[PDB]
Amino acid sequence: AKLTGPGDKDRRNKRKHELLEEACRQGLPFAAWDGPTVVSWLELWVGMPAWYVAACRANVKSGAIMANLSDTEIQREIGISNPLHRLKLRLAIQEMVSLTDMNHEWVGNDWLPSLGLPQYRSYFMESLVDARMLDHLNKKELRGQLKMVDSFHRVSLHYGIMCLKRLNYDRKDLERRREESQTQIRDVMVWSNERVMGWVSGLGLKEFATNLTESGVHGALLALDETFDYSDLALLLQIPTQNAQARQLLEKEFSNLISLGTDRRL
Amino acid sequence: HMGSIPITDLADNIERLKANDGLKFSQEYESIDPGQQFTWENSNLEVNKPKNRYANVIAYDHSRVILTSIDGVPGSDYINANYIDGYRKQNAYIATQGPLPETMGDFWRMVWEQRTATVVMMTRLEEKSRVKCDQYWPARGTETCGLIQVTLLDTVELATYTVRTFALHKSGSSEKRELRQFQFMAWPDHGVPEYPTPILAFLRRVKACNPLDAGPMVVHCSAGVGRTGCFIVIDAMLERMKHEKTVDIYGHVTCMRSQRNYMVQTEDQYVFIHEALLEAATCGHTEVPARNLYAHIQKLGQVPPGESVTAMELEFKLLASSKSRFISANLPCNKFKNRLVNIMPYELTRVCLQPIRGVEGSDYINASFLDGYRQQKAYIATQGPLAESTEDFWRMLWEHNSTIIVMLTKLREMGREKCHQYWPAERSARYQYFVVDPMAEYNMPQYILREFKVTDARDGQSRTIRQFQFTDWPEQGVPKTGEGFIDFIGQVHKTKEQFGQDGPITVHCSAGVGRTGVFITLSIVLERMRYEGVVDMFQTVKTLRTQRPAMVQTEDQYQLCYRAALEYLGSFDHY
C-alpha cells in the first residue's frame, strides 16, 4: 500500500484496542456502556457488517438491552436472521460480560486449509465463523449451513477443534510447534495437511501425496482418532487395492509415525 | 514503409500497408533481410543439441550469450540465447527460449553472470494443454538450480501480469542480488492479441521498474523469437518515439534478424507491432500520481488554445476514437434478449450459458466478462434483466458462481423500465431449474441489500446470493458527490472479502454500460490509487471498452469518475 489512511488494517486494529482500553480504563461494565459505545464495539471488535450495526444504532440504546436481548429479539432489532451470525453475537456479548487473534478470516484462510479442508472456506467465512464458535457448532449447522455432508470431514473437523483445545487456542504456540516438527517425526498432533503430505512423499510415495488435498487429513486426526488406521489413509490416497508394496510401506511407516509421534494404542 | 516514419504519418502508412488484403504488408514483411550469412556451430554440437527447445531455432555464434566454462564439462558455455540491440542501446536485451528442465541452472547462471535485474516472461506455463515453458522459479521458498540459489521473496498478481521478486545467491560467494520477473498473462493461445492495450500497459510497467544501471534485460517465451521479438521491438520503438517522434519498425526488425533468427516470426505479429505503436502514438500519456490529481483535473476543465471544448471532453472523445464483433447478439433467435437492440456483448468476451438441447441461442445472454485490478473475469457487466431473460439471468449467476449482484438503477425511472423485478419479494418463486427464497432485506441510507437462498431443483444444492441495490443515483445526470457511491463500492467489495466469495461480481444498470462502467472503473481506479498511488482514468476506461462496448457512456459520467477519485483521495493522510 503506497497510500496510508484510517482505513488500513493496523489503523482499525489499534483503534479497536484503544476503544477497549478506554472501556476498561473508565471502569464501565458491559451493561453500563452507551449507545454509541456498543455500536463502535459492534463494528470494531465483533466485526459485524454495516447493516447489522445500523439496526443496532437505531434499536439498542444501552449494553443492558443488548445483553438481555433474546434470540428472537436479536432477529428483529439488529436484523440478524442468520443463526451462526447470532451465535457469533451471543458468544461475543457473553465473553465481554464475563471479562468485565483468531477470527473468521484466520479460520478461513489459515486453519481450515491446514486441516485439508479448504473447500469449506466460503461457507465458514460467509457465516462469520471465528475460533470461539467452533465447539458450539451443531450437527445441523455443519450439515446444512456449512455444507459438511461428508461425515468424515465433520470428524476431521472435530479432531481439529480438539487439538485447538489441547493447545488452549494459542495460535502462536500452534505455529511454533508446527515449525519445530517439520523435519522430525515427533508430535504429529500439530501436523498440517502439508506436513502430512510432506510425510507421505518422504516415504517414497510422492505420486499419492497430492490426493490428500481437500481430503480432511491432518495430524490431529491421525493422532487423536483410534479408529483411523493405515487402510483408511490408504484409500484416501486412492491407493490401488492390488498394490501390495505400497500398502506395506504405508502400513509399516504409519506404525512408525503413530508409535514415535503420538500416544495412540494402535 | 521500408524506413523511418514520423508518427503523424503512421496511421496513414498502416492503412496503405493494409489495403488490398494487406498486400503491401506481406511484401514488406517478406522482404526483411539481414543480407548476410551466420554460423551456429555451438548450437549444433552434440552436447548442446538437447539444450535447444526447437532444433530449428538456434543461437548465432557472433551474438550468442556465452556463459563461463565449467572445468571438465564440455558445452558449459552454451545457452540458447542472443543479445539484441535496443534503441541507441547495445546488447540491451537478451532473447532466450523458455528454459528446459535441464537448462534451468544455465538460465539462472546467465542471469547472474550478465548482471540482469529484470526477466520478462511472455507466456503462461501451459496454453491449451500444450507445454510452452517449464516453471523455473520456486513456487515457495528457496530452490537450487545448478550453482544459483533462487529465493522467492514476493508475488503480486494483477489481471494481465504477475510480478515476482527473487533474491539470488551463487555458491561460493556471499554476494546477494535482487531480481524481478514480469510474466505476461494476456497473450491468447492462438494468434496475436485482439487489442494492444494490455501489452502496452505491461511494457510501461517494465520500463518503470527496470533499473537504468543493470545488465541486459532477459526476455523469453517459447523459442524466444515471436512474442519475445514483439516485446523488444515495441519497447525500442516506444523509446525512439519519445526521442525522435518517428519509428523504423522495418529497420529495427532487420537489425534484430542479424542477432537472432526469426525475430518476429509471423506477419500478423509484424502487423500487431504496428498497431500497438499506433495506439501509443495516439493515446499519449495519461497517468498522474495522486500528488498531482487536483491540478490535473483543473487542467482538464480548461479549453486548450485553438480548440472549442475542454480537455476533458477531448479526452473522452478519444476513448471512442480507437475503433463484425456482435455475432451471437444479432442472431434472430437472440435479438429479443437484448434490452437495447444496439447494445450488445463482444463475441470474444461474452458470458456463455450451457446450451440446452434443441433450443437455438440458449447459450446467450447480454453479458460480458470484465477484468478487475487483480484478476480477469472479476466482473460480469450485463443489462437490466428483462422478464424474458430472468430465467437466464439466474442461470448465469449459478453457472459462473456469482453470488454478489450489484443493481445501479430503480425498477422504473422517468416513467420507463430500467430493470425487471427478477427477484421474489414476499414468497418463493421458481425460475425454470431454480428456486429463489427471500431471506432478508436491509435498508441503508443509499442502498438496499437483499439476500436470497437459491436452490438448484435438479440436485438440491443451494447458495446464498446477495444483491446490493444503489438507490441514490439521480434520474437525471450524476451525483454531485461520490461520497455515497464510493462507500457503496467499498461495502460491496468488503462483503466479497469478508464472506470469502471467490466468484465474479455481477453488475447491471439498464444497458449495462453507463453506470456499470462508472461502478467498475472506480472499483479498479480507487484500489490502484490506494496501492500504487497513481491514477490512469483514460487507460482504465479504454481497457474496459475492449471487453464491452461503450463503458462509461457519457462525459458527465467520466467527469464523475475523476471527481470521485479526488474525493477518495481526500480521505487519506497526506491529503
Residue numbers in the entry:
A (entry chain E): 806 to 905, 951 to 1116
B (entry chain A): 1328 to 1650, 1654 to 1905
Q: What sentences appear in the manuscript?
A:
The leukocyte common antigen-related receptor protein tyrosine phosphatases (LAR-RPTPs), also named as Type IIα RPTPs, are cell surface receptors important for the developing nervous system. By participating in both cell–cell and cell–extracellular matrix (ECM) adhesions, LAR-RPTPs play critical roles in mediating axon guidance, neurite outgrowth, as well as synapse formation and differentiation. Liprin-α proteins, having four vertebrate paralogues, liprin-α1–α422,23, are well-known for their scaffolding function in synaptic development and activity.
Finally, we successfully obtained high quality crystals of the α3_SAM123/LAR_D1D2 complex and determined the crystal structure with a 2.85 Å resolution. In one asymmetric unit, four LAR_D1D2 molecules were assigned with essentially the same conformation, which shows a small change of the orientation between the D1 and D2 domains by comparing to the apo structure of LAR_D1D2. Except for the insertion loop connecting the SAM1 and SAM2 domains and a few short loops in the SAM3 domain, three α3_SAM123 molecules were modeled, each interacting with one LAR_D1D2 molecule to form a 1:1 complex with the buried area of ~1100 Å2 on both sides. In the complex, LAR interacts with liprin-α3 via the D2 domain via two conserved binding sites, site-I and II. On one hand, the C-terminal residues of the α3D2-helix in LAR, particularly Q1828 and F1829, are inserted into a cleft between the SAM1 and SAM2 domains in liprin-α3, explaining the observation that the separation of SAM123 to SAM1 and SAM23 abolished the binding of liprin-α to LAR. On the other hand, a Trp residue in the SAM1 domain of liprin-α3, W856 puts its bulky sidechain into a hydrophobic pocket formed by the β8–β10 sheets and the α3D2-helix in LAR. The four protomers are packed side by side via the intermolecular interaction between two neighboring D1 domains, which were not found beyond the asymmetric unit. The three D1/D1 interfaces, each covering approximately 1000 Å2 surface area, are highly similar with predominantly hydrophilic interactions mediated mainly by the conserved residues in the loop regions of the D1 domain, indicating that the D1/D1 packing in the crystal is unlikely to be a nonspecific interaction.
